[PDB]
């Protein structure tokens, strides 16, 4: 996702999390505490990633 800006923040809050800002102004807060990296990847894929159908269409 070359155009999706990505920024990091070390030790800003007691708990870790992700937050995505969408073009529509919506903000999606994802809790990652206690989750493995694979689990986090799968969760973000489910909630915001294009499906294989869309990828094949492209």
């Amino acid at each position: 996702n070359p155009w999706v800006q990505i920024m990091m923040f070390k030790n800003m809050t007691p708990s870790p999390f992700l937050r995505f800002y969408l073009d529509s102004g919506e903000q999606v807060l994802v809790d990652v505490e206690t989750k493995s990296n694979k689990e986090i990847m799968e969760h973000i894929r489910k909630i915001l990633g294009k499906n294989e159908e869309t990828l094949r269409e492209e």
Binding site: E26, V28, D31, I47
Partner: protein
């Protein structure tokens, strides 16, 4: 729908976090009781010797 599911999962993880914090707070209070006993013992000896 996906956003609603995300918020539901956030709520679930929040409940788990609250439970963890409750248990950790119980343990911390129990251990800090002994820590405070140690501190009181040290202080009492200090004040006694100084007096």
């Amino acid at each position: 729908e996906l956003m609603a599911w995300n918020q539901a999962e956030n709520r679930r993880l929040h409940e788990l976090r609250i439970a963890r914090l409750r248990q950790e707070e119980r343990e911390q209070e129990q251990r800090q009781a002994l820590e405070q006993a140690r501190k009181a013992e040290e202080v009492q000896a200090w004040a006694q010797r100084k007096e």
